[PDB]
Each structure stands twice: as structure tokens, then as C-alpha cells.
Design a protein around this ligand. Structure first.
Ligand code: ADP
Ligand code: MG
Lengths: 594, 49, 121, 144, 98
């Protein structure tokens, strides 16, 4: 029962070796392995379309039967490396093949990863949520039998079972040096939260990483991994075995349609100056007033541009706004607008996400008693937006943890013997009612809620809205409210209300969402004129600081710079403008001065 | 929804009813994805304290 | 117990009114084969005429208030509030696409000794 | 008078058939009345929407596509009965300038005392202060 | 009916691109305009009989994987029973006697 020859494997290995034999051709893969040898790694990367071009049949054979074809491929790779250099091949017991390129049907998402893809290559794109600790997995254990003076081996691979006795019950001692071990980490991927329906459920897919692939991933990373989707031994559980991992850019881009780009460019070139004000009016038209707040919310969505210095600095471009006001004010309604409006947002309560909370947390599995580093709500909002309601009700641990992300944009955790430093750069829109309602304009904003004044320093902007009993103002709001009440769709007969379905001038939210996404790609830079202008404005504000919100400081200066940068995005200007700084200056003056 | 002793809700239920009255929806967050269940239901609460 | 395996599976969330086509089975469960979802909504002329008649009554408010809970004792415009909750407001759609709750929610604080449990029932 | 099932059938029929809107004349009547309550005060924008929904519920009884000023008057009558009920309930609950004032007094007296736990709470309670107000002040100082 | 859907789909789309040439199974989902039978109007008579009923879902499970086609090996003898179909439904498995 000993297999002698596999002609299919023989030919398939030769076909790869011919493909790897890149000397008659441009040398791209021959150079890659040469660079790989210089790199001293043992995992070549491969574009599938090259294989398709050189042999469509072989590439189809590979994708339809990932396992055996890769084994032939790794055979060819090791042989090819040994051809170029035997001793370097002898350094490593094996080599590995990383796939890359286009996959028509096999490029899917965890939502769309069907069971049909079992045993096929698949390029799953998604977001990391959970990561396990790095552990050394034993694959091949060498044992020695002094009684027989005999060496025995065993391979586990996909296959209590750890042998310790000879068949004659001689003791066996494990040659730890000769035995083969490899670091091995497990992570979980989910669909990108922006592009996922609320009706459906999560589709979490488990990924296995080995060797160099182990720590090329962290929780809250947007990645695509190519691997072999497989079942597990026993109704069965299914996991993906990674063949190559890459962290795609989290910014991505607004592809959409060129029609959207043309409409955006047409609208932008229509009135570039009024686009900021027009968007603000159409940002939250269901709520009358708070127009400066709407301007700031727009600034938050567009945000600034991060500056990183020679000293490893990461001077943030994000903007953080806090809103305080008595209950029964549209604060909650504002957040619903932002969630519907923002390109990449995520809501959360004062409690935070269940268990994990705002930032990440370490959770044992409790199914096998296994530690897992779970990303929190804040981490998933990286390079996005987070909306926090009942921000006053934040827990004390979270009240401390918010400091790091607000300052550095990165959360760290060394607890439970588990070491991680995750990215959480996220412009945050927080809101909190005053305690006992009934805000008083005599105490600090902190004293009405309690924030320690570190958070208030951290927040770029703070806006206070009060339930003033002005009959004129209340008439304006109430008349607006009743106008929304009286409003009926053009197609309707004033009769029945909308059906109870199971599913869930003024510009559209979607088009606005498209435009801000396009604007977010824009990278407005500074102008010497505006830089001079704002510097005078800041020093003027320092002069205004003589009068006795927080005093103006260098925090406020950088807040203005991001605000002008955000307005620079709003008009799509490739540089900031005096209009941008001027709009920011009046906005800040409105915030600190009523 | 007739609720006798609405004061005696569960703490998680107390969290959930907030969004429920505020949005007629129950949101359950599993990591990033947060599924939503529609509850456009009137409520007749009763209590003593 | 319903059992959906292929693309039929994952098409629904709990709480939706639906109609399933399947196979009655026992291990007691269903081998479902087709699903229809009540994505919107879900009357004899006599009933219509009666409700047209009843609404036209001038004291339809008062009769509805009195008629609902004569069994219970100690009710004065609480019956009216219970009615208006049952009728409920309009689930308005805002011009920009947002929605407001069409419901009305009432709280009955006070004496647990009073037979409001019967009223809830 | 009307049957239990017949009431249910009417309730479903009107709901599925009629979502009333607000007539402009009824709306402005409520608007001016809403300002009067604000000036008299309490009334909030949430209460304004709640009154609007109640008026729609009232007009839905009569199946009117629009809610009349009389329908608004009916809702305001019921709401004002709830508002008077709300005033005495706020008196019962203590949830408000006077509530703000006594909480400040509680804070000042506690700072005077210090800056058992049961005895402190009982003595504060015996000083004509609610336990919930005491507990709220305790939580705030811990947060602060 | 599924096999009929399989063949007619194949011949209709006979010239598939390379790699796509492999034919995939088809779920012939069904529907009808017939009146749903009340859930209470259900007895053992309609077991293994097509039924259509209304309802409202109370709970849902996660999207899991269940085995349709399986193969097993005799641990000692190496005897392999290949491509064993597992009946659709909420069943377990069936092990050979030897
Ligand atoms: N300026 C306004 N314009 C329109 N509606 C408002 C305004 N202020 C408050 N509201 C009303 O307040 C309600 C939402 O209040 P919410 O934001 O939940 O209160 P809070 O955020 O203080 O808990 C909405 O129904 C909305 O109609
Ligand atoms: Mg709120």
C-alpha cells in the first residue's frame, strides 16, 4: 500500500518549475526568489494571473483544488530554490507560496463566503475583530529510544497521541532540537460594517496563520487574505488556512460611478464657496437652528490631515466635538443624521460595546478557556467616525482609557500577559445631557457633568445648547416641527400610514455621503497667506483671552488648522483658503463666545 | 406591549428599552456588525414606585 | 423548528412575519423549502360600513372610552388614553427620509391594588 | 358596547387604513398653545410631538385624514390632565429648580461634614432630603 | 426537479469560460399563491407532505455548515465508503457496522 508514482503530481510539479524557471522570460519570478533568498524569508508571493497567462489550465486546476496543487507548488519552489542555492534551501525544511491577483468568483466577503467554496482558494476581504495569542504548534516530533538505541519520528500536519513509549514500552525521549515547531495564530474576520445590512446576521470566519503570517495582522485591520477554505474534523466546523495576508489601505476610495464624480464636480464647480453653507443647511434640515453646530459636524466628517514629523510624530487630523444640552433636544437626532450621513461611522452608548466596551479588551473564549484579544467599538472606528450617546454615563475604566486614543489615537494593552498596541485614530462625536438637566451658565461644563477637564482639553470643540424659553425662538422651532408633521409625501392620499414592513435645494444624504468621501480623499495643504492670517487670528484670540469655556491655547490653534483643512476639503480646494480659516475662526468664536 | 411593574425591568432590558422607545428598534451588537430588530410597538407600562 | 440550509437560509431575521413552504417532519420540525416575507402590511364591506358608521358617530370618542372597560371600576379618561394608545399616532416619514415613532406609550403609576392587571389582560 | 373582537377589528381597520395628518389650523392653534405653556413654565419638544401623535390617534378614531383644532383641543385637554398629573408626580418624585437647589444644599452640607456610611445617609435623609437625591449626589462626587 | 434544473441550466449555459466550466448545483426554491394553512391545522397526515403556513419568527441560529456528501475510512482495514449522501434535515450520521 505504498504509493510509487503520481504522474499528475509529477507533471504539475514540472509545470510550476517551468513557470518558476523564469530565465527565458522577463525574470520577474526568478528575481523574486533571488530577492526572497536575500530577504532570507521562505514564502514567495505569486500573482494568479501570471499563472493564468502562462497556463490557464494549471491556474484553474490550482483554484479548484487548492491543497494538492499548492503541495506540488511548494515542492517546485523548494526544488527551484535548491537549484539556485542548495544550502539556503537546506536552512528551511520547506517553503510556501503566496497567491495574489484577481479572482472572479473566489474573491468574496464573509457575508458571501458560502459553504460551496470548501477546498477552493478564496480571497476573503474583511475586518479583523478577534486575535488569539501566538502559540508554537508542533508539527513533527522526533523521539529517541535509548533501550533500542533507535530514533523514531512522527508527523501530525492535518492529523494524547504524543508518543512516549516504544512498542516494547521502552521510554522515549524527545529530541527537542530535531523536532519541528511553528508559531501559529488564529484570528476572526467579519464583513466591513459600513457595507453590511442591519437585517442579516454576522458571518464570522476563522482564519489560521502560521510562520511569517502570524503577526502580519492585528484586531481592527482591513485586510484581504488568500487561503484554502476547509472543513474541520467532526454538521462540521469550517476554517480558512491562510496562504498570504495583506493589509489594504483603510481609506480605500469612492469608486462608485463616474456619473457621481461628474455630478460632484459639477455641483462643486457650481458654487464652491456656498457648498459649505449649503451642505450645513441640508445636513440636518429636520432640526432648525444650531447652524454653527451643523458646520462643525460637517468639519468633523471631512476632518483634517494627519501630519507626521521626522520624530515619529503622528499629529492628528481628526476632530473631536462634544455637545451638551438639556434633554428633549435634538442631540440624539443629530447623531442619527451623522450615522445615516457619514461614510464610515459606528454608534455606541455610554456603556459601550458589550463586554469589550469602547476600546479593546481581553476575553477568554469560555468554550476552551482560551484568551482572545477582542477589538472594541472605538478600534473598529479607526479612520472613521464614532457617535457616543450618554457620554456622561461612561464607566471609570473607559473614562481613563479614552485618554490614550484621544491623545495618541492608539490603544495599548499589556494585561493578562497579552501585549498589543492597536490603532484607534477616530474623530469622535460625543454628547451628554447635563446631570439633573437644567444647565447653569455659572459652573464649569465639567461641573454640570464631570469630565476632569482633561477630556474637555482633548476635545477640539465643545458646544452648549440650552432650553431657552424665548417665545420667538420656540415659535421658530415649533413651527418647523409642525411643518415636518404636516408634511406628506407627494404620492399619498392623506389616508393610511406607511406599512409596517419588516425591512428598515436640499441635497441627498447619499450624494452628500459620496461627496464627503471624495472630499476625504482630497489632501488640502497650507497657504502662506492663510497661515499668516490664522496666526494673527490666534494671537487675537490670545488677546481676547484677557477677558474672563476653556481658554485659548495651542490646542485651539491646531483645532482651527484642522477646521480650515476640513473646510478646504469642503470646497475641494487643493490648498487651504482665507475663507477656510475665516469660517473656522467665526466657528470657534461662536463656540467659546455666545 | 402591556408591561406590569415596568420599573422592575432587567438591567440589560433597561438598556434596550432606551433605544426601543427612542427608535422603535432593538439593536444587538456582535463586534462591528450591529443587527437591528424592528419594534414599532406601543407600550402600556404599569408601576408603583 | 424550521430548517433552511441553502440560499433560502440567512434570508430572514427573527421577528418578521413570513409564510414558509416546507415539509412537515419529525426527528417535530419543518424542512422548509420556500419563504415569503411580509415586507409591507399583511375586510368585508359590512365591517367597513360598520366602521364607517362608528367613526361617523359624534360621541365615538366617548362611547369608545366608556365601552372598552365597564368591567373595571375607577376609570375616567384613562380609558380615553388607552384608546388613543391603541389608535396610535402616525409613523411619519420626514422629508429627508428619517422616521418618527407612530406609537404612543402610557404609564400607569400608583396603586397596584387597583385591578389594572385585569385592564392589561 | 362594541364587541371585543369588533373593537379589535375596528382598531386594525382604522390603523391600516388611516394615518391622520395635522390640519394647518389645528397646528397653529397647538403652536400658540405650546408657546403659552413654555412662557407659563414642563412642556418640551418631546411633549409637543407626543401631543401631535395623540391628536392623530384621536382623529384616527373618527377616521379623519386631518386632525382638527377640536381634536387638538381634545388632546391638549387629556395632555393637560396628564400635565397636572405630571406636576404632582414630579412633586412625588423630585425630578426642576427646587430639585437643583436642594441638591446644591445637600452638596454644601456634605462638604461641611467632610471633604458610618449608613448613618450619614440616614442623617441626610432625616434632614428632609430624598434618598435618591442623596444617592445621586454620592454618585456625582465619586465621578468627580 | 433539482436534477432537471441542473441539466437545463448547464445546456443553456453550456459554453462557460475556463474554470467556470465546472457545473454547480442549483437550489430550486419554490413558492405559491395558495392560501397558507394555519399552523394549528397540522397533523401527522401531512408529514412528508408539502405544506404552506404563515407565522412570525421568534429565534434564529447562526449560519452554520452541515454535511451533505461525506466519505469515511475504516481505521484498520482502510476500507473507504465514498460520496455517502447525508439526508437533508436535522439528523446526525450513520456509521457502518464493520
Ligand atoms: N431644534 C429642534 N428641531 C426639531 N426637533 C427637535 C429640536 N430639538 C429637539 N427636537 C426633538 O427632540 C427629539 C429627540 O430628542 P433627543 O435628541 O433624543 O434628546 P436627548 O438627545 O437630549 O436625549 C426629536 O423627536 C426632535 O423632534
Ligand atoms: Mg439622547
Amino acid at each position: 500500500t505504498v504509493v510509487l508514482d503520481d504522474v499528475e503530481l509529477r507533471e504539475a510539479q514540472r509545470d510550476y518549475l517551468d513557470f518558476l524557471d523564469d530565465e527565458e522570460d522577463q525574470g520577474i519570478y526568478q528575481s523574486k526568489v533571488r530577492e526572497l533568498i536575500s530577504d532570507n524569508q521562505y514564502r514567495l508571493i505569486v500573482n494568479v494571473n501570471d499563472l493564468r497567462r502562462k497556463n490557464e489550465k494549471r491556474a484553474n486546476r490550482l483554484l479548484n483544488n487548492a491543497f494538492e496543487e499548492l503541495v506540488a507548488f511548494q515542492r517546485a519552489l523548494k526544488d527551484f530554490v535548491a537549484s539556485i542555492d542548495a544550502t539556503y534551501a537546506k536552512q528551511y525544511e520547506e517553503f510556501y507560496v503566496g497567491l495574489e491577483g484577481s479572482f472572479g468568483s473566489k474573491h468574496v466577503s464573509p457575508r458571501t463566503l458560502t459553504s460551496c467554496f470548501l477546498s477552493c482558494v478564496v480571497c476573503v476581504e474583511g475586518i479583523v475583530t478577534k486575535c488569539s495569542l501566538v502559540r508554537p504548534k508542533v508539527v513533527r516530533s522526533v523521539h529517541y529510544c535509548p533501550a533500542t538505541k533507535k530514533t523514531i519520528e512522527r508527523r501530525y500536519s492535518d492529523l494524547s497521541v504524543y508518543p512516549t513509549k516504544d512498542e516494547e514500552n521502552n521510554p522515549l525521549e524527545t529530541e527537542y532540537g530535531l523536532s519541528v515547531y511553528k508559531d501559529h495564530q488564529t484570528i476572526t474576520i467579519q464583513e466591513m460594517p459600513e457595507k453590511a445590512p442591519a437585517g442579516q446576521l454576522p458571518r464570522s470566519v476563522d482564519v489560521i496563520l502560521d510562520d511569517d503570517l502570524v503577526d502580519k495582522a492585528k484586531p481592527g485591520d482591513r485586510v484581504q487574505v488568500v487561503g484554502t477554505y476547509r472543513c474541520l474534523p467532526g454538521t462540521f466546523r469550517t476554517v480558512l488556512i491562510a496562504c498570504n495576508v495583506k493589509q489594504m489601505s483603510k481609506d480605500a476610495q469612492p469608486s462608485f460611478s463616474a456619473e457621481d464624480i461628474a455630478k460632484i464636480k459639477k455641483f462643486s464647480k457650481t458654487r464652491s464657496k456656498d457648498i459649505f453653507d449649503q451642505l450645513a443647511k441640508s445636513l440636518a434640515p429636520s432640526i432648525h437652528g444650531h447652524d454653527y453646530v451643523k458646520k462643525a459636524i460637517l468639519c468633523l466628517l471631512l476632518g483634517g490631515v494627519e501630519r507626521d514629523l521626522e520624530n515619529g510624530s503622528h499629529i492628528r487630523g481628526d476632530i473631536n466635538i462634544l455637545l451638551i444640552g438639556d434633554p428633549s433636544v435634538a442631540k440624539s437626532q443629530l447623531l442619527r443624521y451623522v450615522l445615516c450621513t457619514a461614510p464610515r461611522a459606528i454608534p455606541t452608548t455610554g456603556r459601550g460595546s458589550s463586554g469589550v466596551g469602547l476600546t479593546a479588551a481581553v476575553t477568554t473564549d469560555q468554550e476552551t478557556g482560551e484568551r482572545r484579544l477582542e477589538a472594541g467599538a472605538m478600534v473598529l472606528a479607526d479612520r472613521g467616525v464614532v457617535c457616543i450617546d450618554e457620554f456622561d454615563k461612561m464607566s471609570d475604566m473607559d473614562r481613563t482609557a479614552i485618554h490614550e486614543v484621544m491623545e495618541q489615537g492608539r490603544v495599548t494593552i499589556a494585561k493578562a500577559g497579552i501585549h498589543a498596541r492597536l490603532n484607534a485614530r477616530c474623530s469622535v462625536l460625543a454628547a451628554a445631557n447635563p446631570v439633573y438637566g437644567r444647565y447653569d451658565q455659572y459652573k464649569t461644563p465639567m461641573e454640570n457633568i464631570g469630565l476632569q477637564d482633561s477630556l474637555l482639553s482633548r476635545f477640539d470643540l465643545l458646544f452648549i445648547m440650552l432650553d431657552q424659553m424665548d417665545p420667538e425662538q420656540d415659535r421658530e422651532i415649533s413651527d418647523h416641527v409642525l411643518r415636518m408633521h404636516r408634511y406628506r409625501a407627494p404620492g399619498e392620499q392623506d389616508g393610511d400610514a406607511m406599512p409596517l414592513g419588516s425591512a428598515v435645494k436640499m441635497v441627498s444624504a447619499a450624494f452628500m455621503k459620496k461627496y464627503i468621501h471624495v472630499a476625504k480623499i482630497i489632501k488640502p495643504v497650507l497657504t502662506q497667506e492663510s497661515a499668516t492670517y490664522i496666526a494673527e487670528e490666534y494671537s487675537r484670540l490670545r488677546s481676547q483671552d484677557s477677558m474672563s469655556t476653556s481658554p485659548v491655547t495651542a490646542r485651539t490653534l491646531e483645532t482651527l488648522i484642522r477646521l480650515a483643512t476640513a473646510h478646504a476639503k469642503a470646497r475641494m480646494s487643493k490648498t487651504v483658503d482665507l475663507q477656510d480659516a475665516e469660517e473656522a475662526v467665526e466657528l470657534v468664536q461662536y463656540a467659546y463666545f455666545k | 406591549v402591556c408591561i406590569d411593574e415596568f420599573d422592575k425591568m432587567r438591567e440589560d432590558d433597561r438598556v434596550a428599552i432606551h433605544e426601543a422607545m427612542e427608535q422603535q428598534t432593538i439593536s444587538i451588537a456582535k463586534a462591528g456588525i450591529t443587527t437591528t430588530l424592528n419594534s414599532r410597538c406601543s407600550v402600556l407600562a404599569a408601576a408603583n414606585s | 423548528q424550521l430548517y433552511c440550509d441553502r440560499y433560502l437560509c440567512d434570508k430572514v431575521v427573527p421577528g418578521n412575519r413570513v409564510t414558509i413552504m416546507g415539509i412537515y417532519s419529525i426527528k417535530s420540525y419543518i424542512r422548509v423549502l420556500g419563504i415569503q416575507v411580509d415586507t409591507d402590511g399583511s375586510v368585508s364591506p359590512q365591517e367597513e360600513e360598520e366602521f364607517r358608521r362608528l367613526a361617523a358617530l359624534p360621541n365615538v370618542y366617548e362611547v369608545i372610552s366608556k365601552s372598552i372597560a365597564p368591567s373595571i371600576f375607577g376609570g375616567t379618561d384613562m380609558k380615553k388614553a388607552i384608546a388613543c394608545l391603541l389608535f396610535g399616532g402616525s409613523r411619519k416619514r420626514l422629508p429627508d427620509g428619517l422616521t418618527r415613532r407612530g406609537d404612543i406609550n402610557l404609564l400607569m403609576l400608583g396603586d397596584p391594588g387597583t385591578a389594572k392587571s385585569q385592564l392589561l389582560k | 358596547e362594541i364587541d371585543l373582537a369588533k373593537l379589535k377589528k375596528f382598531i386594525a381597520y382604522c390603523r391600516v387604513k388611516c394615518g391622520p395628518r395635522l390640519s394647518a389650523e389645528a397646528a397653529e392653534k397647538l403652536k400658540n398653545r405650546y408657546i403659552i405653556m413654555r412662557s407659563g413654565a414642563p412642556i418640551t419638544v418631546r411633549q409637543l410631538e407626543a401631543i401631535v401623535r395623540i391628536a392623530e390617534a384621536l382623529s384616527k378614531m373618527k377616521l379623519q385624514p386631518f386632525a382638527t383644532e377640536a381634536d387638538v383641543e381634545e388632546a391638549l385637554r387629556l395632555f393637560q390632565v396628564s400635565t397636572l398629573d405630571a406636576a404632582l408626580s414630579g412633586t412625588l418624585s423630585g425630578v426642576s429648580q427646587e430639585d437643583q437647589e436642594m441638591l446644591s444644599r445637600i452638596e454644601k452640607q456634605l462638604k461641611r461634614r467632610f471633604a458610618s456610611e449608613h448613618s450619614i445617609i440616614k442623617d441626610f435623609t432625616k434632614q428632609k432630603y430624598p434618598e435618591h437625591a442623596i444617592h445621586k449626589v454620592l454618585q456625582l462626587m465619586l465621578r468627580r | 426537479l433539482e436534477e432537471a434544473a441542473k441539466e437545463v441550466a448547464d445546456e443553456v449555459t453550456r459554453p462557460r469560460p475556463s474554470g467556470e466550466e465546472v457545473l454547480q448545483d442549483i437550489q430550486v426554491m419554490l413558492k405559491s399563491d395558495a392560501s397558507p394553512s394555519s399552523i394549528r391545522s397540522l397533523k401527522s397526515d401531512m408529514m412528508s407532505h408539502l405544506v404552506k403556513i404563515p407565522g412570525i419568527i421568534i429565534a434564529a441560529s447562526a449560519v452554520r455548515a452541515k454535511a451533505t456528501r461525506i466519505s469515511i475510512q475504516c481505521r484498520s482495514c482502510r476500507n473507504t465508503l465514498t460520496n455517502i449522501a447525508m439526508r437533508p434535515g436535522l439528523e446526525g450520521y450513520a456509521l457502518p457496522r464493520k
